[PDB]
């Protein structure tokens, strides 16, 4: 019985949700991907020598204009909450997404990873590693730093780690 893991990528506009998801599925960096296009992606893949189907929603735009958002939020098996280390507001807003997930899933905790994207940027970085890690510690969830830019950092690891969390819960 091959399981499906339905994964939902959430976070403020501009943090790199699309770039990360495209890097994962297509192994290329696509800059400035249409900000409002919401795509899902489905593939069989092997993680830690166990096959699964990943059904991934790259969220975009307003929930009230999305055909698929409601079902993915309600039935998702795990979430990536992404912020950009160059956008302090996107970091602050992690709390909004965290609350939203726990409200919709109606649980005290739920599989999720905190993803600090754009760590290839140094001068523009406004959120420190320690700020990210403390937030993850507060929520009792894993923390990972990523870059979707070539060569990508921790992109496969992020999606795989979310699957690992779902399997470990």
Ligand X SMILES: Nc1nc2c(ncn2[C@@H]2O[C@H](COP(=O)(O)OP(=O)(O)O)[C@@H](O)[C@H]2O)c(=O)[nH]1
Query: Quick one: which segment of 13-21, 41-49, 120-128, 129-137 binds Mg ion (CB under 5 A)?
Result: 13-21
Q: Which residue is nearest to ligand X (CB)?
A: 16
SS3 19: helix
* Neighbour tally for 111: CB within 10 Å: 23
| Site membership for ligand X, residue 80 (CB under 6 A) | no
Burial class, 37, CB count within 10 angstroms (exposed 0-12 / middle 13-18 / buried 19+): exposed
Annotated ligand binding at 24? The verdict is no
Annotated ligand binding at 36? The verdict is yes
The residues in 104-163 that bind ligand X, with binding defined as CB under 6 A, are 117-118, 120-121, 147-149
For residue 3, give the DSSP letter.
P
How far does Cα 165 stand from its chain's mean position?
Answer: 13
| Site membership for ligand X, residue 31 (CB under 6 A) | yes
Question: Backbone phi, then psi, for 140, in 5-degree steps?
Answer: 60, 45
- Least separation in angstroms between residue 107's CB and ligand X is 25
- Give contact residues for ligand X (rule: CB under 6 A): 11, 13-19, 31-33, 35, 60, 117-118, 120-121, 147-149
- Give contact residues for Mg ion (rule: CB under 5 A): 17-18, 60
């Amino acid at each position: 019985n091959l399981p499906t893991y339905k994964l939902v990528v959430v976070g403020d506009g501009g943090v790199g949700k699309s770039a990360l998801t495209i890097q994962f599925f297509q192994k290329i960096f696509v800059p400035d991907y249409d900000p409002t296009i919401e795509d899902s992606y489905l593939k069989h893949t092997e993680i830690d020598n166990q096959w699964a189907i990943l059904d991934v929603l790259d969220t975009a735009g307003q929930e009230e204009f999305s055909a698929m958002r409601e079902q993915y939020m309600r039935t998702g098996d795990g979430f990536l909450i992404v912020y950009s280390v160059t956008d302090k507001a996107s970091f602050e807003h992690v709390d909004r997404f965290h609350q939203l997930i726990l409200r919709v899933k109606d649980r005290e905790s739920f599989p999720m990873i905190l993803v600090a994207n754009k760590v290839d940027l140094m001068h523009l970085r406004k959120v420190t590693r320690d700020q990210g890690k403390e937030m993850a510690t507060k929520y009792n969830i894993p923390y990972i730093e990523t870059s979707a830019k070539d060569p990508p950092l921790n992109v496969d690891k992020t999606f795989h780690d979310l699957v690992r969390v779902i399997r470990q819960q």
